[PDB]
Amino acid sequence: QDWNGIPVPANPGNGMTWQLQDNVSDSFNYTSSEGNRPTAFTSKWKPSYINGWTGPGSTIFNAPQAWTNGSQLAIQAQPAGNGKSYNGIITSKNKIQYPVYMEIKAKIMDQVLANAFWTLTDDETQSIDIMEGYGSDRGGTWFAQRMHLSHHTFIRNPFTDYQPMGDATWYYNGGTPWRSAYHRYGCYWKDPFTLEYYIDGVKVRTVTRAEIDPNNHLGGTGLNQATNIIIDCENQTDWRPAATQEELADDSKNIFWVDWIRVYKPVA
Ligand SMILES: OC[C@H]1O[C@H](O)[C@H](O)[C@@H](O[C@@H]2O[C@H]3CO[C@@H]([C@@H]2O)[C@@H]3O[C@@H]2O[C@H](CO)[C@H](O)[C@H](O[C@@H]3O[C@H]4CO[C@@H]([C@@H]3O)[C@@H]4O)[C@H]2O)[C@H]1O
Numbered sequence: 001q002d003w004n005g006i007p008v009p010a011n012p013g014n015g016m017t018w019q020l021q022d023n024v025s026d027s028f029n030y031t032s033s034e035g036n037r038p039t040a041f042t043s044k045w046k047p048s049y050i051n052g053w054t055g056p057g058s059t060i061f062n063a064p065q066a067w068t069n070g071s072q073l074a075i076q077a078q079p080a081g082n083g084k085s086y087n088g089i090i091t092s093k094n095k096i097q098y099p100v101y102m103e104i105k106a107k108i109m110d111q112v113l114a115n116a117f118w119t120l121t122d123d124e125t126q127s128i129d130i131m132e133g134y135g136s137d138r139g140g141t142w143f144a145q146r147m148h149l150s151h152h153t154f155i156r157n158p159f160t161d162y163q164p165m166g167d168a169t170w171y172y173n174g175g176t177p178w179r180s181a182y183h184r185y186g187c188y189w190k191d192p193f194t195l196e197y198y199i200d201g202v203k204v205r206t207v208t209r210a211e212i213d214p215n216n217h218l219g220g221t222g223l224n225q226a227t228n229i230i231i232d233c234e235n236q237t238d239w240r241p242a243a244t245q246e247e248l249a250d251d252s253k254n255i256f257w258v259d260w261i262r263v264y265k266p267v268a
């Protein structure tokens with residue numbers, strides 16, 4: 001695999017080591033697209049959201065915009081007309097649950113669109129955002145230069161959304177924009193109350209119990225459910241400027257590239 005010899009940066013415990021979870025890991029070293037979906041892909045992933053929802057704001061999730069090129073997954077955006085985009089997404093066919101380390105090597109788009117690697121339960125109440133980036137300087141240099149590290153707890157009806165909002169939820173890298181290179185974005189979901197984030201193999205943030213669910217949307221369980229993996233892009237016009245149609249058409253800038261995803265659990 002692509003990550004051969006790259007250590008897992010999280011601590012598996014004394015007298016423990018890390019073990020790869022095959023069914024949610026992929027080096028994406030195959031070619032695939034709409035009408036050419038091989039087993040290497042369909043055994044693990046589907047190019048759609050976890051249900052029929054087509055995305056927030058000006059997003060239109062669309063299967064053709066997820067594909068692979070022999071070495072990387074492309075999560076692509078396209079013009080949809082009427083101020084909207086078509087947006088790539090994949091989701092896992094298999095669930096994961098703490099304790100679990102999950103990491104991608106990826107390069108976000110030079111777009112105002114969100115690009116994210118995240119989890120979401122079938123009931124849509126629990127989410128971890130391993131990363132959520134906004135690449136273009138047209139969205140503000142402040143955003144282009146920061147990576148969002150967060151999680152959500154929801155009540156579905158009426159819709160109520162909690163995430164931590166402390167300054168440490170947006171991680172700065174000296175002014176280098178995140179669009180400029182591939183980085184490794186990782187998170188150890190250690191238990192329902194403990195999340196650690198890792199960028200380029202370095203621990204950059206720890207979230208503990210008080211920040212997990214202070215409004216009690218989950219009734220005291222914390223982030224405890226088996227959940228789905230998602231990698232997507234979104235046109236989040238409820239709070240972001242809309243992408244222009246020409247930006248969405250520019251294929252030198254409209255692809256969120258993921259070289260690989262790897263997932264491990266701690267073992268003796
Ligand atoms: O950028 C990546 C993500 O980052 C953060 O994680 C965000 O929290 C996440 O947005 C969320 O994704 C899901 C979970 O909660 C919201 C949210 O936008 C989303 O789910 C939809 O929420 C809307 C309400 O705003 C609806 O409740 C919708 O329900 C659907 O209703 C019908 C159609 O399909 C089924 C769905 O449940 C139903 O039969 C939710 O899907 C990302 O931005």
Ligand SMILES: [Ca+2]
Pocket residue numbers: 002027028029071072258259260
């Ligand atoms: Ca690869």
